[PDB]
RNA sequence: GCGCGCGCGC
RNA sequence: GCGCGCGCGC
């Protein structure tokens, strides 16, 4: 483990050099090489290397707290009997930051606090540092807190304001190549990458390799596209169910076909989801008890069609049988006892249509074949199949258990057992399989395999571009460590040049509640806190939200969030924002997300501050 | 509250 | 830019 000795192995001790020599160092290899234990050979060598009477200091960024924890303690223990004194910065610690920084060696930070302390000029310059380390360095772009970060040291580097600079050093399992989709772009992308970090080498295991391959998951992986049915006679009854059904919604609320943006919907696909959510979703409430109602019929149906494709007719006519069961059970409407008449009429059909052999989902015959084959070869194999839907996993499942033909096979849902079904995972770990199947599933021990199973070419062509997305970063890796360094230099010194050049480049309005559309308040009552938060001054405000002190408060930066406000008119209480405690004041807080502007009485909805350009006028202590 | 990044869809 | 969501930071 991460607290106990360890011999570095041979490929661990060929990735620290680079940064050992004193390079600006991106260094890249694969989840579990151990890059947690690079960095502390690397940190250890740095603090050591100084002469008697002089001192390094390391800052390590982690993007996350549990990560921020763990190595906390790593470097902890790791440097008990070295001396050094040894302490993290996050969220939760919210101090004296300078003197933190000042009277300790390492320092774990979460980056956004350096981000903090660099703004307000309490940390006036990164030259205290004589080495940072990002982990998860690949993050290093686009207005992520590691470039913030990087901008303040390029801006120093750049305006010869010296200062000597710490030396930076990154930690990836993939470099990425971004948008790109060819070998230029890709290059391009690992050139911008290398420039935000100041790296000038990119270290990677060339020649320790066959010991690297010898604990890193890489399986062979598989393509297996194949055939649909040659007619879905199940989807052909659902679907008239399905028109049947939103006729009989644009009865009770007519327009219907205007409430999203999601257009041209079709039966049966991911997409016709997100046209219920974006319906279920709308309305703006009696009408809304008769729609939910057949939404939420349509979404049944939208489910077994997605069963039908991928799994047996019997699967999904279950799912539809199960619930059908479920609500003349529950109790009968004139509306949820149409719907259920509606679906009684074919039910004869479809229990017809259901067993009929010809019918049968020649897929599965498929997915049969790939897990016969290896529990032939390997009858120890453990498995993990990957699913589309929820309702699939249990569709498999069922299928599996009532197979004659894998019987040797003993299923498990998740979130013994020798195959396990699923959506997504943690934890998980699928190395720990020695069989990885992707079932229709838009995705990504030694003798392991992977098999990508569809009869989409879709789906197949986004692997294989996944898959040459991949293979363009480590050629575009294998040029550039072939660039003799001052050569590389120079290049990454030009597009920082060029990167920099870039970042060097009242009428009052009315806010209702989005759900009632109730007057809130006008603008000219608002002010600003910092400059990122918005309040409401005066009493009137008071009356208009209610709130619910929330038990679990955090103290953020400029305040602390105390309370939950919500909207006053009870046949509403939508979701306002915060009231928080700000330098003694008890003063509500507001997303603009939540309300409607108005200006001939124009409705705008807004989603950040950010884009509303009104007269914004900041707080005054006294008013 | 705000900020950051990702994925899908127009 | 818009829509939906997911993860995370202060
Ligand atoms: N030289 C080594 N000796 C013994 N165990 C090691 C060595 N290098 C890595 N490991 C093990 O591999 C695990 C990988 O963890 P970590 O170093 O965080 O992986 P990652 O490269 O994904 O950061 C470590 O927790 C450790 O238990
Ligand atoms: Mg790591
Ligand atoms: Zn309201």
Request: hydrophobic share 35%; net charge neutral.
């Amino acid at each position: 483990n991460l607290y106990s000795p360890f011999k570095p192995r041979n490929y661990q001790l060929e990735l620290a050099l680079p940064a050992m020599k004193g390079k600006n160092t991106i260094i890249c290899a694969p989840t579990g090489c151990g890059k947690t234990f690079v960095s502390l050979l690397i940190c250890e060598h740095h603090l050591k290397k100084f002469p008697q009477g002089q001192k390094g200091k390391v800052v390590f960024f982690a993007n996350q707290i549990p990560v921020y924890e763990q190595n906390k303690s790593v470097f902890s223990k790791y440097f008990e009997r070295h001396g050094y004194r040894v302490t993290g910065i996050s969220g939760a610690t919210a101090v004296p930051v300078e003197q933190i920084v000042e009277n300790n060696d390492i320092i774990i930070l979460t980056p956004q606090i350096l981000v903090n302390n660099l703004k307000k000029g309490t940390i006036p310059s990164l030259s205290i540092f004589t080495l940072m380390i990002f982990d998860e360095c690949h993050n290093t772009s686009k207005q992520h807190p590691y470039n913030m970060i990087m901008f303040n040291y390029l801006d120093q580097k750049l305006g010869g304001s010296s200062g000597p600079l710490p030396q930076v050093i990154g930690l990836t399992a993939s470099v990425g190549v971004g948008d790109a989709k060819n070998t230029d772009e890709a290059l391009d992308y690992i050139c911008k990458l290398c420039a935000s970090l100041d790296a000038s080498v990119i270290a990677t295991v060339k020649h320790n390799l066959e010991e690297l391959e010898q604990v890193v998951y890489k399986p062979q992986k598989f393509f297996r596209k194949v055939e649909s049915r040659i007619s879905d006679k199940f989807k052909y009854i659902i679907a008239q169910l399905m028109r049947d059904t939103e006729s009989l919604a644009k009865r009770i609320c007519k327009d219907l076909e205007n409430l999203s943006q999601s257009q041209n919907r079709e039966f049966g696909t991911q997409k016709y989801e997100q046209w219920i959510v974006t319906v279920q979703k709308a309305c703006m409430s009696r009408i809304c008890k008769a729609l939910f109602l057949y939404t939420s019929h349509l979404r049944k149906y939208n489910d077994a069609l997605i069963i039908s494709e991928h799994a047996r007719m019997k699967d999904a006519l279950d799912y539809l049988k199960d619930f059908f069961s479920n609500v003349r059970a529950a109790g009968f409407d004139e509306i949820e006892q149409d719907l259920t008449q509606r679906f009684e009429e074919k039910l004869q059909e479809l229990e017809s249509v259901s067993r009929d052999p010809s019918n049968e989902n020649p897929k599965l015959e498929d997915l049969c074949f790939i897990l016969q084959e290896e529990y032939h070869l390997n009858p120890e194999t453990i498995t993990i199949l990957f699913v589309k839907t929820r309702a699939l996993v249990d569709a498999l499942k069922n299928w599996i258990e009532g197979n004659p033909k894998l019987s040797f096979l003993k299923p498990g849902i998740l979130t013994n057992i020798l195959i396990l079904t699923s959506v997504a995972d943690e934890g998980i770990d699928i190395a720990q399989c020695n069989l990885v199947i992707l079932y229709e599933y838009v995705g990504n021990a030694r003798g392991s395999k992977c098999f990508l199973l569809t009869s989409n070419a879709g789906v197949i062509e986004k692997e294989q571009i996944n898959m040459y997305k991949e293979k363009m970063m480590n050629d575009s890796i294998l040029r550039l460590q072939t660039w003799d360094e001052a050569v590389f230099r120079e290049k990454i010194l030009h597009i920082q040049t060029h990167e920099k050049f870039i970042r060097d480049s009242k009428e009052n309005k009315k806010l209702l509640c989005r759900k009632c559309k109730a007057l809130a308040c006008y603008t000219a009552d608002v002010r600003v806190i910092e400059d990122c938060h918005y309040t409401v001054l005066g009493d009137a405000f008071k009356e208009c939200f209610v709130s619910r002190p929330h038990p679990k408060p955090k103290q953020f930066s400029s305040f602390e969030k105390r309370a939950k406000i919500f909207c006053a008119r009870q046949n509403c209480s939508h979701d306002w924002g915060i009231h928080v405690k700000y330098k003694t004041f008890e003063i509500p807080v507001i997303k603009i997300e939540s309300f409607v502007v108005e200006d001939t009485g124009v409705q705008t909805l807004y989603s950040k501050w950010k884009d509303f350009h009104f007269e914004k006028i900041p707080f005054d202590p006294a008013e």
